Design a protein around this ligand. Structure first.
Ligand SMILES: [Zn+2]
Ligand SMILES: [Zn+2]
Ligand SMILES: [Zn+2]
Ligand SMILES: [Zn+2]
Ligand SMILES: [Zn+2]
Ligand SMILES: [Zn+2]
Ligand SMILES: [Zn+2]
Ligand SMILES: [Zn+2]
Lengths: 272, 272, 272, 272
């Protein structure tokens, strides 16, 4: 089969298309990268008909040496990935010393990876370390209700985590480490990539106020489902707040009992 | 034809897919079980290529002895059922004494039924008794507006039923027995399964505050439609409450007249 | 071709499916009937493989003598029409004296037309008279925002029409005769069918508080678009009201100028 | 291949269908025109089986002499474009002196272009001048949240632009020239077409209070994405306002830093 029918190209199409249908990825909003093994891509080598283009990295990462990824392109729309995966996605392989990468497949007509790729790489590095190599996905999208909440809730990790845990029972179990929140920062900068990667050490979800969310996970579905869980809770919260707020909710005691039953250690600071 | 094209596998795909598109089943949220007859499955026996795996039940149910079911898997996403029904669904058959069940088809790669299966079984038992064997479906989903309402309405069966009946004219006719509401409880426990099954004696719909809904019915479509009716009313209610509340509504007298016309006996406690 | 591929069966599938996707037709909510000519159906006669079943009408309508219709079935779900049009739709032909009708095609497994068919017929009669035979469609659905508005706006034709005209500029041009509003009434009764048909003399749209909408038009698309226009305005209004109400809006003067430009005569009572 | 499979007919189908699914184009609401080159259409000439019909223009535009466009039809529904592109779209070519145009393909059964075509032409002219011929698309739709905001925000370009920039971080970067707002005007008039074209000199987005939006861009996707970006911000804003308003937001300083980083010159009047 053609690489377009591969599990990982189909996976990238599914995730980007689902996020598009959720209303989280207007225009080129959002970006998605997936760490692969050589063994995933090697069978499809005869599908690679052009010369690998080289792009240097300003900050090398030796931890990622020789590692292939499939990634969304700069200025590309999640809506279009299903229509032309080769135009909108690329497979890249970081070189031997992590000083740059080669584009191996896709990103046709001189397209390049998302301008956020260096920031994705830094977060991949921190998640590899934090999860002993199990995490493989970084997903950014403009999740609508989470965005709306950033204007009305204290932009504070403990406050925000507690509300999201209250907003759907599964949340504490899905993200016991809570949701990290940064100050508003200029997107595309080194600073925002650094700050995100730091919080990725402590959380699988990071919020960018007035902008969107960053998630990490071992697979596309687990990462998408993580974001979707947080966004569903946020959707419930927006309804409840719009109705004048909570008359009742999940208590700290109930949340602790929940953690205990499911063998997770919830972020203590959100349990007042 | 392959069992994937059977009415019941297609039915499970339709229900889980529709619920996914409704936004009720983020991640692995939700679960669905359907009681079958041997005669439904027997024609497809040559599609069963592996050895039935046995799983014991902590609480036996002799009422279900020898009974086959098709069920959603643990940790499986409703979104994916249409893509790979064999990975995400299983057909199980409870053994001769109801002390356990065999997995006959599906749940590939060592998957197991939803961890809520024992609780589904207990509710199936109570609905069989309550409806003289006509009910065959238990459906749990994270119906968004119903969830939101649990934070703002008294979590009380009579209050909640009356509002839902007011929220769409058909509601009293579709669920004259009203909607049972439990206290918040730790999901997955024996306690929540027991309490749900008790309320299933009196209602075809049970709410879990800050979590979701459980419904029972004779067919997938009737059960889905039951939940969808309640959820549509809840959606209307959320809009009305967000606009500052009801200026006018369906009265108790109008609700009683409605019951009389359609030959149903509405839950008296919701008719003040 | 099979009658399933006919313009009118495809049209019924499109309309019911679109309304389902809009969230207007949970369960069996909604019903749709389309007046045909003999010439539409005659080519497909060899597709009619069973004996026409006769159903008498309590109130005859001689105006409809010998007239064929395609109709949605009782207890049938709009969601399922696309999956099995023959199970969920029927073609009926009223007999020579309008005292009853024969089912000619569809409504398989002893299904019957919507229990609202007599009420549809009465409204068809009044619309034929009001439009000199141009109207051919009666559509009922549970349009969500229109429903929500019935709890918060005076249930009064002039008030409701003015708000809907304000809620989207096209509204006055699409429904210059405004939207008739009934008191809440027990659905399925002779009384509600009579009252609806009376208002159908003056308006192409009729609201049933706490229930839904009835629309009439010359084609499926014009009738659907009429309802969709009103429902879109209602959706805008719900947002605006939820934000605390109008700071500015379309004035009576602007509405009159609009009417004049498009050569329509707007309901004077809504123009204060 | 048939012209229906051409990039531009497929593009028109995608854009109108996506806008339909967004809920922005009830009934015949909305219209879309795309400026082509002769070279785009010339290969498909054997698909043009009828005689070009001539329609004069009241206001000639010599700037558009000999220029082909593909356009949506008058009274046509965006929903139907995918079902029958030839019925719902047309290819037109303005004549040698810009005094009228010929219909070359489509608009079957005596259909004509959107009655807004002259106004589209005037805006095309101004955008050609403003962008040195790079803009090729004018898109009008009834974007729901933007509409709702026009009732609650000062209908003032600087106020509205600032809120939309605050409502999603990308907005300042996507539309640094802000969003022009007209007074309410009677649609279809010369006056509204003139006023829109004037604002098109200064902005790529123009709002019509209580009605919808007009956008311009070099391609269908960039123009659609421009509107979708503004509409997504508006959706966030509606949620935030419905929750009681902003507790925090993007500051003028942060917005200026954003502009600087991305090399754009933001509308100074929105930066208090
Ligand atoms: Zn972003
Ligand atoms: Zn942190
Ligand atoms: Zn659950
Ligand atoms: Zn009870
Ligand atoms: Zn109804
Ligand atoms: Zn009237
Ligand atoms: Zn318009
Ligand atoms: Zn301006």
């Amino acid at each position: 089969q053609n690489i377009t029918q591969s599990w990982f190209v189909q996976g990238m199409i599914k995730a980007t298309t689902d996020a598009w249908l959720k209303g989280w990825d207007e225009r080129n909003g959002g970006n998605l990268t997936l760490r692969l093994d050589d063994a995933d891509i090697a069978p499809y080598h005869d599908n690679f008909h052009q010369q690998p283009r080289y792009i240097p990295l300003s900050q090398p990462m030796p931890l990622l040496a020789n590692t292939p990824f499939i990634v969304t392109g700069s200025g590309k729309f999640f809506r279009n990935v299903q229509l032309d995966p080769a135009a909108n996605l690329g497979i890249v392989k970081v070189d031997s010393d992590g000083a740059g990468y080669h584009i191996l497949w896709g990103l046709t007509n001189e397209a390049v990876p998302t301008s956020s790729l260096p920031a994705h790489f830094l977060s991949h590095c921190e998640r590899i370390k934090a999860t002993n190599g199990k995490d493989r996905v970084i997903m950014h999208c403009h999740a609508t209700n989470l965005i709306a909440l950033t204007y009305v809730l204290e932009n504070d990790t403990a406050v925000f985590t507690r509300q999201l845990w209250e907003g759907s029972t599964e949340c504490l179990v899905v993200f016991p480490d809570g949701v990290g929140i940064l100050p508003w920062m200029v997107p595309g900068t080194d600073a925002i990539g650094q700050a995100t990667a730091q919080e990725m050490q402590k959380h699988s979800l990071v919020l960018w106020p007035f902008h969107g969310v960053f998630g990490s996970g071992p697979t596309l579905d687990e990462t998408f489902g993580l974001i979707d869980t947080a966004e569903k809770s946020a959707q419930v919260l927006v309804k409840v707040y719009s109705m004048g707020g909570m008359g009742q909710t999940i208590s700290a005691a109930e949340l602790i009992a929940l953690g205990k039953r499911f063998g997770v250690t919830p972020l203590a600071s959100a349990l007042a």
